[PDB]
Amino acid sequence: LMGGFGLKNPPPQILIKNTPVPANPPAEFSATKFASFITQYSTGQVSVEIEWELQKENSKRWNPEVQYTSNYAKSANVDFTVDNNGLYTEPRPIGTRYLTRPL
């Protein structure tokens, strides 16, 4: 109901954690397991590559259709670019229903 593709077997969840590396244990044994760990974190890169199957229009409409254009005007800030201090902003939501076809 939010829109999208309903999938019985969706893309599976990729779960990730840091392996716990404990600090120094005491000299004698104690079975109350571990509260002392080495405070750490990880970083890295992650790349996702989805292939999408397109469906071409077969339209026999005569007149021009409605497009998603950018307003060519004297603007202070370009749409869908970064700001004066590098904040990336998205000025409006873009749907996907622009082309037409008969019912």
Place this chain on the structure above:
Amino acid sequence: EVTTNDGVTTIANNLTSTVQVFSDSEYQLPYVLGSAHQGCLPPFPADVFMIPQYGYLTLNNGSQAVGRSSFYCLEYFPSQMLRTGNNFTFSYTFEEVPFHSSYA
């Protein structure tokens, strides 16, 4: 060809005039059929009927057009110009539709 002259209108016969026929087998015009209109074949085989006029409707902000109202020039479709010695044939295969329940 018909020619009016003081209500003594004679009908002559153009041997060289053509007739453009196409079947829109890609469904890219508004499908005005399936709307229970007149101008079908008559029920009785010994009747001569008159072909209806094609005319479609598109999107309307009341009685005005919207920018997404389509316009279709039908001479932008490949026709088959049929002079009096020519004929038009095509064939069509229905896709799998369920049987009509002709029972109570």
